[PDB]
Swiss-Prot record, chain A:
Pathway: Isoprenoid biosynthesis; isopentenyl diphosphate biosynthesis via DXP pathway; isopentenyl diphosphate from 1-deoxy-D-xylulose 5-phosphate: step 2/6. This is 2-C-methyl-D-erythritol 4-phosphate cytidylyltransferase. The keyword Translocase does not apply. It comes from Mycobacterium tuberculosis (strain ATCC 25618 / H37Rv). Was identified as a high-confidence drug target.
Length: 222, 226
């Protein structure tokens, strides 16, 4: 059973503001996109990686990644990007599983990727890696008034790679197109698909702000 | 009107596993407890700090803090510690406002402390600093099956200092029906919400993160050196 990983890397990273689109930032000698691609490939369970990048960076992405990933242009939002990437999937020989993995989670351990794939092979149709909440979480209305504080025991913070049987992911995206989710599993939940969690890893944090970058730098050097 | 800040620092920092109770860990030459106290006082709007520490650490806390903070013995959990600290408050000269601030958020900027007090002076009865969510949140069962994904838009991550009108906070903690040894509250506002106090949000600050793990510590260190 073949496993394809789709890597959305086409966002600009406005909250990061490092002078270049985020996926192309050089973290201690190596771009975030190459790091995220290595994590996937080093897992030993990913057969093909397809990366989606800004349309004017496809050449640069190719120079960086060479043979290691197929390159396509991303879209206006992450959902668009993923839809574009899914069109690459072979008609005649479709993979058994697809992972979707944010390039922004560049320090994701390969062991986490393998754990997601192991859960898929155990028969779960949709799998997401999760961690317990760090901060208290509150529901807040539009005027900044707290509505309440959900019981945290039943809440989790969700990471990527998220993994799916191919047919389920495709159906979910096709049906979702009949209706701004940031989370692939939400689309599967929407058509009544059932999602199982596995343990994530604090190292799979999304590099979003400069403080996230500082943390990534401290991890990587030393 | 007086502002008293209470600092729960009576936790053992098991997840940090750094040799001493977390509040007493020396981050680049300063204990977290001293850094937390400094951020409150440098705000310019905190009149008095009460710090609660593990009972066997009270003398050491005083030698560290000197005149800068009043020290008391904490309790079996965060909620219990805070309740103990609240008993310290003068009844004849009650402060107008009380802040509650985790010592584990040692890099909190003084500006944040000021922003919270400013909201209380704007007439909000209770105030919490917040940040948008980083990860998607899901509700999950027993079991590990996803129950659903709440709308991210209406959710916030919440930090400290949390600020309150004194009477509201006292009534939330002296609720007779509150079983203190079994209290699993992570923050103070949820006790205020429980009795129907209205809580207002202000912008927090990424620098006010809780130092809980080695990874948090790594980040805190890179922040204080750089
Ligand atoms: N049109 C888009 C937008 C985002 N992504 C990717 O989806 C992942 C998650 O996006 P996120 O980090 O949340 O936002 P960014 O767009 O990358 O950054 P920002 O919102 O601050 O601009 C990122 O790897 C990003 O490159 C994408 O492929 N295509
Ligand atoms: N009995 C307790 C427990 C916690 N706290 C304080 O509450 C804050 C938050 O605690 P938290 O970081 O969640 O747990 P810790 O006890 O500090 O660490 P750990 O859970 O890993 O042991 C800390 O400043 C901590 O010192 C406290 O004053 N008294
Ligand atoms: Mg975005
Ligand atoms: Mg604790």
């Amino acid at each position: 059973g073949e496993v394809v990983a789709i890597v959305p890397a086409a966002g600009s990273g406005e909250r990061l503001a490092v002078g270049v689109p985020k996926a192309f930032y050089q973290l201690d000698g190596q771009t975030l996109i190459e790091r995220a691609v290595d994590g996937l490939l080093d897992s030993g369970v990913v057969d093909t990686v397809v990366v989606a990048v800004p349309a004017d960076r496809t050449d640069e992405a190719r120079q960086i990644l060479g043979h290691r990933a197929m390159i396509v242009a991303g879209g206006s939002n992450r959902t668009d990007t993923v839809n574009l990437a899914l069109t690459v999937l072979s008609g005649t020989a479709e993979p058994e599983f697809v992972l979707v993995h944010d390039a922004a989670r560049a320090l994701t351990p390969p062991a986490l990727v393998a754990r997601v794939v192991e859960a898929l092979r155990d028969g779960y149709a949709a799998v997401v890696p999760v961690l317990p909440l760090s901060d208290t979480i509150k529901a807040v209305d539009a005027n900044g008034v707290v509505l309440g504080t959900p019981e945290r025991a039943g809440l989790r913070a969700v990471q990527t790679p998220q993994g799916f049987t191919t047919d389920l992911l495709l159906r979910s995206y096709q049906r979702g197109s009949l209706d701004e989710y940031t989370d692939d599993a939400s689309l599967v939940e929407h058509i009544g698909g059932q999602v199982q969690v596995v343990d994530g890893d604090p190292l799979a944090f999304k590099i979003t702000t400069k403080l996230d970058l500082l943390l990534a730098q401290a991890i990587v050097r030393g």
